[PDB]
Design a protein around this ligand. Sequence first.
Ligand SMILES: [Zn+2]
Ligand SMILES: [Zn+2]
Lengths: 310, 310, 310, 146, 146
Amino acid sequence: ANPLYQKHIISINDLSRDDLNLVLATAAKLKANPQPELLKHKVIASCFFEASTRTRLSFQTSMHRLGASVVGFSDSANTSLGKKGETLADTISVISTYVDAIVMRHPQEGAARLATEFSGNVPVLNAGDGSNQHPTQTLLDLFTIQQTEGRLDNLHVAMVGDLKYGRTVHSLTQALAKFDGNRFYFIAPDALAMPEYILDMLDEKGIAWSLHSSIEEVMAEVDILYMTRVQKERLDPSEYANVKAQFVLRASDLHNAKANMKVLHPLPRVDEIATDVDKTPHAWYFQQAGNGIFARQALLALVLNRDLVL
Amino acid sequence: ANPLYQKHIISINDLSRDDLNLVLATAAKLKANPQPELLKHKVIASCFFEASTRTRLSFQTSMHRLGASVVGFSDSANTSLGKKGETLADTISVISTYVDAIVMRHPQEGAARLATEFSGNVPVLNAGDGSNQHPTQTLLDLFTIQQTEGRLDNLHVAMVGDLKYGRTVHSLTQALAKFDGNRFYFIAPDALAMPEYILDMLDEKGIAWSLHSSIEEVMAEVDILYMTRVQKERLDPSEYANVKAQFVLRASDLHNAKANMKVLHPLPRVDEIATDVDKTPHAWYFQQAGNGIFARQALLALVLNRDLVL
Amino acid sequence: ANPLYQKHIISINDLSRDDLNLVLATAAKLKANPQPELLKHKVIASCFFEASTRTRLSFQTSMHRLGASVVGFSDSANTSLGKKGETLADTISVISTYVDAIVMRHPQEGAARLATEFSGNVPVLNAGDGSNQHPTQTLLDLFTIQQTEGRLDNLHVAMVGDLKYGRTVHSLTQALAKFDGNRFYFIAPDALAMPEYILDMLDEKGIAWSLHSSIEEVMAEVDILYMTRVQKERLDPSEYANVKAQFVLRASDLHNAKANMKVLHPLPRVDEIATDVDKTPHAWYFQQAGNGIFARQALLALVLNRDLVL
Amino acid sequence: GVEAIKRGTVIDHIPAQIGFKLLSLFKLTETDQRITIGLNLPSGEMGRKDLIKIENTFLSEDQVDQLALYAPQATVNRIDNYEVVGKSRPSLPERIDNVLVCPNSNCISHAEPVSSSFAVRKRANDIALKCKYCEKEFSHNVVLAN
Amino acid sequence: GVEAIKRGTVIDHIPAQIGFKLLSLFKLTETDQRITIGLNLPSGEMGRKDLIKIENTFLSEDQVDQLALYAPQATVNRIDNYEVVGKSRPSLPERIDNVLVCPNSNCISHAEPVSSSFAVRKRANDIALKCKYCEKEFSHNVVLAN
Ligand SMILES: [Zn+2]
Ligand SMILES: [Zn+2]
């Protein structure tokens, strides 16, 4: 029986250093040797109450590469929660009487933990809930860092962008604070700054972090530059002074970059990474996106198979 | 060759007592022993021109549990009937040159019989047509009644809600009037009353029915309480005096309930079943929804397999 | 100065048989002998926050036909209340520093009384505050009733239509319950019936009122058939069952009617008074509308001239 | 058994269940005075009463009359330095202003910065309140909301 | 005694202008039994305190845990046959369910049928409350904002 078998994947806080490491070891493995009927005969729900290209299409393709069947919806507009007016609690109650794992995206923070309370014994894997958590992103980010850096301890990681509303940077700082010696650099407009709650945690664990007005001031010292998008759809009126990005990575800026340095981005990206960065040996965001297939196949393998031998 | 092989499932009126009973015997059976490649190599269309969570997702999961492939649309908004302006008659004509059974939901009454006239030899199974018929609902309601009551003869069945626009109660009274000794109690606001056409039929067959202003006045005498939703989307302007539900089942009301009594509801439900009823041994609407999987798998088995041996 | 000099006219409930009698007497004088300069040098505000044809235009024509100047608005859309966000109280407060009298129409019951608290010494004549009161309507009705029936005491008056929301029939029932032996017939749907508070007031003066489901039932007995339009705009969506005139009156119905009887109507008329009544001796509504000039200009004169006109 | 009071007001004989409804409705607690409240007291006269003693505080003529609306059998005892100098009692007030909200949703009194006001009226079972502004009469029970 | 009960509860060292919110919150008027309330009495160190005396009634878990979060000064005394069988002051809990309302506009807890729940990290500064659902942490002052 394996430790993440039947687990709910909602927040990185409930995942340990060993649970993460079991995902990446699994990932690397299916990436070396593909299992096409590993989930032959499981049907999985794919409930997206909010927009997606990568999380849903990667999820759905990982499910197919493993032999599973997918049922779902790309918008609540057509569900009876969107037209006949039912609660999300009833939605998840009947959908868990039909399927074997629920994958869901959702605009309010907290909807993934909501689902679990009504899902009975079906695992709920959180594809993103408003600006809260994005666990499966973080697992493909960790797989991509390990792959380019051979270590997840002692990195210099710079997080550039909308860190307030960024569900992706909220999950990634919580998983990297579970490894040794990682140094953090936050570059965000201050009204879209890192939530003090992750900061207190960074402090309670004695990890070193810092703020910087610029990307030129840390370029030389970083292993990873994790760029993010200004979450327009999440901004409040007050923040409209902040829709256009403040820090824009252009290929010239990479001049004093460590040769090993990788530019990561969850994507979609708007104006903040100039397309001239795409042609450098530092841009690695599309390889990161490809790596969504092995990490989400490993997550489904482990939650739905009591023991894997591979 | 079996009697529902290649049949169209449109209205309960064309289904007999024996056709229904062949579905439930089938249902119970696949529910005891699952057939994962029974429909291996059939492709099925799933055409929803109107909102759904349960009918479409249960249908689609039953199709997958049996080995079939699904193609379709959750809204006409994207079809060429919704943007290039084609008739529903042409829609069904080309879709029947591609698939093996058409499952369709549709806002106008009568659209399912429309489809059959153009579907050639492909079976059309009606997922619901406006306020007319909902056959596959009724089959999972009958499976759930039999399962809780061991009989489909001599029940006391109370139908509470919007019986005028309720496609579900229109199909269920027509199937239960095909068994012996069932007593019926209708509790609806009168401008959303049971259509006289089902009533005349109840009379021509000499079945006993009755109207009641209250749920307390029949609670003690009923085997099933079938609660329904006020079909807002179907109400005419005149009926706007009726959007908020008149009769709301709360857990206290169940006090003098027969111990065997089950609360059924097709769902979604709005304000009419208080969530305190969900925690009683009388609420059974989510089990009813789970039972959508075995009844719609049995319906597809029989229409698409000339003989089943199981 | 005369009994209504500087006096605000907000509701019929604040005026006496004596003030009504003075206002009609003055109306009979001015109709016979115009006073072109009577308000030469006065400017009146004509403030309509709601739609109007009849009241806003006869008011601004009465002011003009006495030498007054009119400033104001027929729509709030382009006032600062309409676009910059101010309160009614600050509209009224700045507008009291410019004009000599304020005529105002509002969608909210209570708006003219609210505006007297801030008009200072300037009078506020109510052109209709929501469904509450419309006092100048009632003065041209009374002028027209006495003009036709010779009297305002011992009249049989049938008020047909929407009595709930009829700001017109609310003020007229209060105006007529002040003379003697007037008899009421009230013909409405239940949902739009006469306000309770009105009937109480009737009971205390021991006025004989009686409900009736048909014009035909009162036709031969009545003298003034005062018809009303359904206040489409004020109906609750629950009330939308009766938006079309339940009682519509065609010329046929006048068959069994009292040769002194007059059909009165505040107007707009929609479907309730069929265009053939327009040729009968009984139809008097376009005549009633024109009496708006004399009643309306007798009011202006008394509120702004100490010296009673002759 | 409740408290000795130097000077003020003791509204005694408030029906058990209304004592708290009053300390909330008319801002009595919003003071810096010592208030002693006895909820649920054996009265004999009534089975149970309620009792509020507000130290160094008097009520007014209209203030006390506002009480008729919830507590006609109350008795406002005016006390000056331990002597019951006054034995005041509630008639219906002619108008309650500022404490109630008009049940008419489309009344102006909701949207504008003005205080409410209601003419009180002894109808024929309970008491009826007519809004100043929209002029609709409502049952007093209704006014006291949901 | 400064008032008296056989069995029941007397809560003491309530901050001024908290006793009355407490009467509200724990619904202590839904009770047919005697209650004494000492509004705005003294308390030498911190001048005035309020005091509540629920006769022949005692508090359940939840209320005392709330009491910890609304009045860490108060002390609750289990009085049986007049003897103060126990006087215990509250210690904060780990989690508060079904009364605090989460500050985040976008928390699912609002729109959906779930009882709220908060984790309680006593910070050297104050009480950090973390929502069960959105995982945000707030200042207890943000949260208890009445
Ligand atoms: Zn009002
Ligand atoms: Zn929250």
